[PDB]
UniProtKB/Swiss-Prot annotation, chains A, B:
Keyword Methyltransferase applies: yes
Gene: nep1
Annotated site location: Stabilizes Arg-54: D55
Subunit structure: Homodimer.
Binding site for S-adenosyl-L-methionine: M140, T141, K142, G161, G166, I184, Y185, N186, K187, G188, L189
The protein's name: Ribosomal RNA small subunit methyltransferase Nep1
EC number(s) reported in the record: 2.1.1.-
UniProt source species: Methanocaldococcus jannaschii (strain ATCC 43067 / DSM 2661 / JAL-1 / JCM 10045 / NBRC 100440) (Methanococcus jannaschii)
UniProt function note: Methyltransferase involved in ribosomal biogenesis. Specifically catalyzes the N1-methylation of pseudouridine at position 914 (Psi914) in 16S rRNA. Is not able to methylate uridine at this position.
Catalytic reactions of this protein: pseudouridine(914) in M. jannaschii 16S rRNA + S-adenosyl-L-methionine = N(1)-methylpseudouridine(914) in M. jannaschii 16S rRNA + S-adenosyl-L-homocysteine + H(+)
GO molecular function, one term: rRNA (pseudouridine) methyltransferase activity
One BP term from GO: rRNA base methylation
Domain of life according to the entry: Archaea
Amino acid sequence: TYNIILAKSALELIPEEIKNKIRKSRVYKYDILDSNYHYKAMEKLKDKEMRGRPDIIHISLLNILDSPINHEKKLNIYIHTYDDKVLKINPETRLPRNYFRFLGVMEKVLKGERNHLIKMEEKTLEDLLNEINAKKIAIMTKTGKLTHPKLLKEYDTFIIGGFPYGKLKINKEKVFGDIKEISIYNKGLMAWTVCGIICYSLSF
Amino acid sequence: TYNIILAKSALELIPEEIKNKIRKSRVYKYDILDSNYHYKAMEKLKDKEMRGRPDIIHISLLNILDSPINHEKKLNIYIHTYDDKVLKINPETRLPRNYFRFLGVMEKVLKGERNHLIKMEEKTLEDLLNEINAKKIAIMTKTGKLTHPKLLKEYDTFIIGGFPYGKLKINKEKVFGDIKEISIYNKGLMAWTVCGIICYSLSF
């Protein structure tokens, strides 16, 4: 069984610092940060350029959940968020194709309401890796060593940044397993594309 | 280069047939059929189960446009719609990640408004195939010949149904190229997954 993790994911309830600049509207009623609707209120938010993009997770998760490797129940799926929450996603989760429906599901989970298919915990990325006993970990980044996807099968755990801009920063000294930075392509790709490539590498 | 075609796609302006049953609302201000908002008015719409699902095209295109094979400029991308319009999508199209923005773009294109990156003509699927000189055509469908992704490279043209339910029918005697039904997996997969798998099998 492989672990796939979308890490430092741009999926958060509205940060306390900017709550006062954001009101629920009929156009967007959710308490999830989304720069399409909240760009200006994010002006002075730390790391603003890597936050407020729930859509990246939505699309990545639509790829992951429908992959053959997932239909074969050979994945454990994790969303690690910017503010250190981890959502474990049941392989049989039927995720809404509608973006707003997706937001309403995620929003409840993030507020701690029980969802039997999506479990949430406060948890760092490093603690996550150690609890799942990750041993051979590939961090997908473009500055990584170019690797034909055929080799991805040698790892047990994959990490993909669930964000638009920046680099995934991980304290390797706090992680028991071995981490290798891997690039499967010479150009920058979106998270959902990397997720797809990994998932299909594992089937074919 | 390869052609990839999402065919008989559930992407249409609202059919005149049902405009009278449409109650317009500020929560959805697009003239594009979306069963999420128009289910009732679609109750006696012909082939309603395979229409009104523009998100399938949105997600599929997000996958196709960001694939390595497309960054390498080796794809011609086409959306053929249920009502016989063909959109040729420029490889460098930046498609909105927000669903509503996507509807906004598609709405204008379908109405005939010029768009230098997305060209629209009225045209049947069979005519499109002949006109682009598709020679070896693979139609993806879960009742087709089970085939390993690696073999996809032998075809020049791929057809994936841009719809939720139904099977895709093409008039064999109206197409100059050879059509073959392919299945790359034994469970039914969503269109975006099939598109992703094809695209990645062309790169690796």
